Structure formats: structure tokens, C-alpha cells
Curated annotation (Swiss-Prot):
Shown residues within the full chain: 125 to 388 of 403
EC annotation from Swiss-Prot or TrEMBL: 2.7.11.1
Something else known: Centrosome amplification can occur when the cycles are uncoupled, and this amplification is associated with cancer and with an increase in the levels of chromosomal instability.
Organism lineage: Eukaryota, Metazoa, Chordata, Craniata, Vertebrata
GO cellular component: axon hillock; basolateral plasma membrane; centriole; centrosome; chromosome passenger complex; ciliary basal body; cytosol; germinal vesicle
Gene from which the chain derives: AURKA
Protein name as it appears in the record: Aurora kinase A
Keyword Ribonucleoprotein set for record: no
Crosslink feature (Glycyl lysine isopeptide (Lys-Gly) (interchain with G-Cter in SUMO2)) location: 131
Similarity section: Belongs to the protein kinase superfamily. Ser/Thr protein kinase family. Aurora subfamily.
Amino acid sequence: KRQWALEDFEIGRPLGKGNVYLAREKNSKFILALKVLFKAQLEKAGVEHQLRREVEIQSHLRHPNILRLYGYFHDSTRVYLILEYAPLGTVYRELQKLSKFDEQRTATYITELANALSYCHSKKVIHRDIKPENLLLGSAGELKIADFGWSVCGTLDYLPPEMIEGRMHDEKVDLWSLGVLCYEFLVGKPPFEANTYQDTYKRISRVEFTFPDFVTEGARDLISRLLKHNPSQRPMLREVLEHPWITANSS
Ligand SMILES: N#Cc1cccc(Cn2cc(NC(=O)c3n[nH]c4cc(-c5cn[nH]c5)ccc34)cn2)c1
């Protein structure tokens, strides 16, 4: 499995913050991403078990639309995660430049994500934290799931009424997330977005959303199908991949 230390990698530009830095393995010249987690931070938050879960889950996941976790290592105060480098950055950054995506680009990201989520659910692994900042873009502009920190409570967006209400939940949480993600992709903002945490809770709880005029009948239908209060009423990933709007606009 290879034994690693800090003295094996040349650190560079910070790629993101939660931090993750650009790194080069000195011997192989291998470009990767180093997520640097402080032990004292994980101690004062009691999330050490949650990190182990993420490490165990992502290291055994193998799919072209899932970012690879090559390995881990720790020192006296820090914990390091050797992650795959996504050359084209986050989906969040992309959406900020473009404002919103077209039906073609949206349906392709949805397909790529639904496929990756189906691979995850077949292994009984539920993502729970699907959002643009946790999604990356590979060398070919393919969508890739990066963060797996909540795999098996800041912004409520993307979380279904089950999780926010503390009730038990299925793989269906990721289907709701898919619906939130499809809307955000086409509109430019998530469907339950509010100024306060308290208002976002109400928007989610009572499923309040309205489509702007430009959102098409086909896109409206899939989003409506995915944003159901009852998780049993949510369509399966196979139903989404074979949805008319998806197949008509997907690559
Ligand atoms: N300035 C600038 C700029 C503008 C455009 C493109 C790029 C290239 N770019 C590549 C990345 N890649 C990553 O950020 C990245 N690559 N691999 C990652 C893994 C995680 C990660 C954190 N937890 N789990 C995974 C998080 C982030 C990453 C970001 N920008 C940089």
C-alpha cells in the first residue's frame, strides 16, 4: 500500500478551503492534492471517527466519476490525504463564471453523477453531501465526486427534509440532492436558498420551490420528480438516467 511522509511531497498552491494543497511526489513527479487536517481541530470537534469512515469508504471506491483517494498518513499534529488531482477545478468555480449551465451541460453532469451514485449505492454507500463545491472536473471535463466527509451541518441547501428533521434516511437523500443540483445548475441558485438558516429549514420542510420562466417542461418534470417530501416517491437513479429530458440533452 506504500508508506508515506511529508518529506516525499513538494507542496504548492492551495486548491481549496474547508486545507487542500497542490502536491508533487518528489520521486515519481506525480501531481496530486494533499488535504491537510489538524489532529487538534478533529479532537475539539470529535470528528476523528467521521474521517476514518471517509478514508475507508473512498479508498475502496473505483469509478471514473469518483475522485480517487490513493492513501493516507499522519505526523505529530497533522493527518494527510493523498487525493486525485482534478485538472479543471470545481463545478462551483465553473458555475460562478458561466452563471448557469445549458440543458446539454446540465444533463451530462446529472448522468455522470447518477452513474457514480449508482456505483456508490450498489456498495450500500450513501454520499449525503452532494453540492457544487464537493464536485470536481477531470481532464476531459467529466464530473467527479471529490469530498466524502459525510459518507455512510452548515448550509441546509442540498439536504432533504428527512436529514434536517433528524429522522432516518435512505440512498434517496442523494436523489433529493440530485434534484437540488439540477435546479442550481440551470437557475444559478439552489431551489430552497434563503437569507437565514431558519428560513432555509422551512423552505426545505414544506418543499417550497418555483421555476423561473426559462426552465423547460422536461427539466421542470425531472426536478419535480426528485424534490418529493416522501423518499419512497423519489425515482431510482436508473429512472433518472432513462428520463426523456436526460437522454435528449445528454452526451
Ligand atoms: N487559480 C486558478 C485556477 C483556475 C482554473 C483552473 C484551475 C485548476 N484547478 C484544479 C483544481 N483542483 C482541485 O481543487 C482539486 N483536485 N483534487 C481535489 C480534491 C479535493 C478533496 C477534498 N476532500 N476530498 C477531495 C479538493 C480539491 C481538489 C482546482 N483548480 C485553477
